[PDB]
Design a protein around this ligand. Structure first.
Ligand SMILES: O=P(O)(O)O[C@H]1[C@H](OP(=O)(O)O)[C@@H](OP(=O)(O)O)[C@H](OP(=O)(O)O)[C@@H](OP(=O)(O)O)[C@H]1OP(=O)(O)O
Ligand SMILES: O=P(O)(O)O[C@H]1[C@H](OP(=O)(O)O)[C@@H](OP(=O)(O)O)[C@H](OP(=O)(O)O)[C@@H](OP(=O)(O)O)[C@H]1OP(=O)(O)O
Ligand SMILES: [K+]
Ligand SMILES: [K+]
Ligand SMILES: [K+]
Ligand SMILES: [K+]
Ligand SMILES: [Zn+2]
Ligand SMILES: [Zn+2]
Lengths: 155, 369, 69, 69, 155, 368
């Protein structure tokens, strides 16, 4: 109930600590910034919406990518629209950006490995360890991702 | 106007606990898409949280309990049978791949949001990933592993005059209560189900010790609470508290498991009721820190947090949903706001006046003139 | 639809191109101004001068479509 | 029909402006060229890459008329 | 028939006179030149025709001027079209060009003087000297010009 | 290809002679619009002629005859009654304002075109304003005042080896004949009406004098000549002439009064017939100098000269565009026309007469 030994660990609080060389140059990495000097005047807000659904159209996928690939890139310019299309038209935006690493962070396939799913799950139905064992290239993290996306394909 | 900060990482949605377990952290992913699809991205900062190291973990827990988390694997689950039962790891805290890495992000998230408030240049921050409070020093409990809420608070305590904690979650915040039970600068309020419910504590006499009397409050309740029933008990105390406690920092744990349609809960709440709370807190214009926590109906959870996120901006967002990937999961109505169940209130008006008639002048014992 | 995705790209690039177009006509607007005055001077005051200038400018772009017919 | 004078003022000026318009679209053609192939990569080969480019370029001109309407 | 005194006046012909410092720097004044390097390729010939009838439209008259005012001006540039419109838009092309003098040479009115015509010609009908006498500002050259132009106004 | 030069001024169209007079120089104005409306302006040089001074006028006429032209006015017409009849000024040469200034331009025009041929860098030139040949030293005659054709030729004679003159005009070119009647380097051909016709000369015996025999030719004819009838007499002589005379410069007076529908003429010609002539002359590729002259049906005149102007460019021109003088072009509004119904009154023996006689007469001249 009230375990005296498991209460606390000498927090040592001061409650002023004026300018104690504040932390987080690394714990938090800014990836999006407002802009309301020119954009948010009820004149150019819609200009970004037309861009938004433009990505969710007949354009290249990276792993299956509707709009989220593009929003992180607009922050790269901080005030522009067309500069993104220069690098979006580029062969890959995934590869040449390795220091930011966000390109792989957004979302986290072969017919053969897909063949083993109906052969894998449809038999044991609750294993979740032979699932990655017999499909070696994919992890249980990736193997779970298809389950949520597959739910639309029935209807 | 007020600047706002929001945190998120993408790898959380892939974690899985095990068979039939109700907690599934994929819920956080659906919320993130809603903030962008509604256009609210124009009005907030997004941040990526990095992995939390064992350093800040050792600041509350033992360094040997941690080394066990590194040596465990699901394939070698059998060798550690004696230790597993010893630390409550089991049916309520199953073992799986990436168990530690899951907590690294939730720990890193709130601890990161702690600092930009310590920077003292903004008021509001949010992290729906955290909200884990049932953990103890040497054992997991109640589906939680790390009491990251306290670990985030310790950065705040160094800078901030007084920190008020709140726990709306239908589960009782016993873990946080344990760490501030004899100190005056931290008040611990908690509204919760009482009577045959986990963790089985939270009576009226749970008041404090030493100088801690009238500094760790509770206000237990029973099932069937209505949104309007909530009104007569939340507002009057808080207005009495602000001149009394003189807070400088709020920490509002928005436990969304208290909403209707829950596997576990038996309350009679909607989105408007729980969201009606925050408009009163925002009225005071003080440094806030919103956090999530429990919640097992993934459908209604994102509907609540997305609303509360807009309310911190004092912005309106209309009722309805745009094109998105997770559209069909939002019930057959496909409407943001919802209705409650048919349950009535089981608490009498005399049952309301009990602690109200008793406790308001009890607080007047404290020094002020 | 394939053609729709191109039209969503169209809305992005409209204001940038529309700015340069406005710069073009300003060089040739001087010819349009006196032309509208003299016509109204000879025919009569009843004709709205500014409307005539707007009519020709829309017609000039119609023939530019032949580059990409 | 006073507007007959304006249509002949146009014929003097149309071949000149068509030089500058071709200069403009050549800047943005780099956006269309590799993009149209990528559309034909995700969809079958039956669609002609050149036709869609000719379609949108004509479509862009129609919207510019609002400045001079 | 054959008047010996009125035959000739000592022509003094040579029939070679190689390079006798040829005359006509002044007897003939060039006012129009072909151009067939860019123009006459069956691509830009029509471009000048659309210009031509453009002058014979709702544009200023000088004395009544359909197209002839414009053709002498194109020779001024020798290869251009738009440069003429700069000076054609000018207040007058008649006044600022005084050395070339062609501005007055192309074609060569008041209701009062026009009133005296029906009062002048319709009485005497064959005078041609009182015509200029009673209309003093105009010459018999100008008074004759209206006769040919008036022939359309009946039908 | 061959470069071409054309001359014109605008003030000529305003001049007027007097009541009921047939010559009216407004005819030149209508021709000028046709060259531009047909697009032929792309293929020729236009030049403005300046006023001709008394200097070049004194080179043939007397300086006192000229001073009379300056002192005359229509209001003071009466004082000079004795002198007026003395110089043939009268019904055929009325007096009017700007009489001298009219001739200054026609004199300046051909004299100007003389030089660009003397420049020896082109072959062809045109001036439909000139073509006045009936004038004499001390008197006007036959509606003409100045024999500018000779004044233009004198610049050519200095530079050009031999100048062949031609006179298709239904009137006879007696004035030009008078000035080259005893010189061999100038041949003077002239086809004309003969028998009760102005100037009442131009018989077969009008041949020359001294060495001038077989160097000033005539070939008179009667009314009703057809376009095809013209063919059998123009071509055969000229082919015989070129090796014989060895010309270096042609002067083709395109007297257009010989066409049908004339107030004065009684020939049976059309535009194609008179224009058929020049294609044969252009075939020889030699320096030409086309001139106008007579003509009193203003409607068909411009139809002829505009065609001949295009033929010097060996270009085709098809009907009429929008213009100011459109309605004057008859009820047909077609460039080419038809003749009257007159037949030829000249017998085949009448054709062979000078042909059988004169071709070997010319063979008397030296050549081997
Ligand atoms: O069969 P339904 O009436 O549609 O309900 C199911 C069911 O929930 P209940 O068991 O509480 O009825 C599933 O639970 P299990 O069958 O897995 O025990 C649950 O799965 P989770 O409990 O793992 O969430 C699933 O939810 P989901 O569709 O999100 O997988 C949910 O279906 P609904 O969400 O449509 O109610
Ligand atoms: O009456 P129209 O059919 O229009 O013809 C007349 C007529 O010519 P005809 O007598 O040959 O028909 C005039 O001749 P007169 O009446 O003077 O004898 C002539 O005048 P000129 O002979 O003095 O030229 C005039 O010509 P213009 O209009 O140039 O004065 C011309 O009219 P059209 O030129 O309209 O045919
Ligand atoms: K609670
Ligand atoms: K306390
Ligand atoms: K003759
Ligand atoms: K001779
Ligand atoms: Zn909870
Ligand atoms: Zn004649």
């Amino acid at each position: 109930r009230i375990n005296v030994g498991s209460r606390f660990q000498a927090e040592i609080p001061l409650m002023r600590d004026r300018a104690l060389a504040a932390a987080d140059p690394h714990k938090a990495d800014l990836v999006w910034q407002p802009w309301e000097d020119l954009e948010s005047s009820r004149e150019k807000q819609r200009q970004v919406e037309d861009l938004l659904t433009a990505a969710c159209s007949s354009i290249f996928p990276g792993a299956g990518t509707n709009q989220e690939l593009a929003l992180h890139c607009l922050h790269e310019s901080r005030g522009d629209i067309l500069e993104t299309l220069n690098k979006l038209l580029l062969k890959k935006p995934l590869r040449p950006h390795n220091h930011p690493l966000a390109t792989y962070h957004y979302t986290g396939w072969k017919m053969a490995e897909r063949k083993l799913f109906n052969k894998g799950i449809a038999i044991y139905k609750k294993d979740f360890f032979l699932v990655q064992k017999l499909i070696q290239t994919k992890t249980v993290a990736q193997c779970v991702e298809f389950y949520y996306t597959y739910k639309k394909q029935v209807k | 106007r007020r600047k706002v900060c929001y945190y998120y990482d993408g790898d959380v949605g892939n974690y899985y606990y095990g068979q039939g377990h109700p907690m599934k952290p994929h819920r956080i992913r659906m919320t993130h898409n809603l903030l962008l699809n509604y256009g609210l991205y124009r009005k907030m900062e997004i941040y990526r949280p990095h992995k939390a190291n064992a350093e800040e973990m050792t600041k509350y827990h033992s360094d040997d309990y941690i080394k066990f988390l590194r040596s465990i694997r699901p394939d070698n689950m059998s060798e550690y049978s004696k230790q597993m039962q010893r630390f409550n790891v089991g049916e309520d805290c199953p073992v799986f791949d990436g168990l530690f890495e899951f907590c690294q992000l939730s720990t890193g998230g709130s601890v990161a949001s702690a600092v930009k408030l310590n920077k003292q240049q903004t008021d509001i921050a949010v992290n729906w990933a955290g909200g884990l409070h049932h953990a103890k020093k040497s054992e997991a409990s109640g589906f939680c592993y790390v009491n990251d809420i306290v670990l985030a608070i310790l950065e705040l305590l160094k800078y901030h005059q007084r920190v008020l904690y709140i726990d709306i979650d239908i589960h009782h915040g016993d873990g946080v209560e344990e760490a501030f039970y004899t100190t005056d600068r931290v008040m611990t309020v908690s509204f919760h189900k009482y009577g045959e419910y986990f963790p089985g504590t939270g009576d009226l006499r749970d008041i404090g010790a030493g100088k801690g009397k009238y500094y760790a409050v509770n206000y237990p309740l029973r099932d069937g609470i209505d949104d309007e029933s909530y009104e007569a008990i939340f507002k009057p105390v808080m207005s009495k508290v602000m001149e009394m406690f003189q807070p400088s920092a709020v920490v509002l744990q928005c436990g969304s498991d208290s909403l209707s349609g829950d596997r576990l809960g038996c309350f009679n709440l909607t989105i408007k009721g729980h969201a009606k709370c925050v408009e009163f807190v925002k009225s005071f214009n003080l440094p806030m820190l919103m956090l999530g926590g429990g919640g097992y109906t993934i459908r209604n959870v994102a509907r609540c947090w997305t609303y509360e996120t807009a309310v911190a901006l004092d912005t309106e967002i209309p009722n309805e949903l745009p094109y998105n990937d997770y559209f069909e999961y939002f019930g057959p109505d496909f409407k943001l706001h919802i209705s409650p169940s048919n349950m009535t209130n089981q608490n009498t008006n005399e049952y309301l006046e009990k602690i109200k008639q008793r406790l308001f002048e009890n607080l007047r014992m404290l020094p002020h003139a | 639809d394939p053609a729709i995705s191109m039209d969503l790209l169209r809305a992005v690039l409209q204001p940038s191109i529309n700015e340069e177009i406005q710069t073009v006509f300003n060089k040739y607007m001087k010819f349009f101004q006196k032309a509208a005055l003299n016509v109204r001077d000879n025919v009569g005051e009843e004709v709205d001068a500014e409307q005539l200038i707007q009519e020709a400018c829309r017609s000039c772009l119609e023939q530019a479509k032949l580059l990409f017919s």
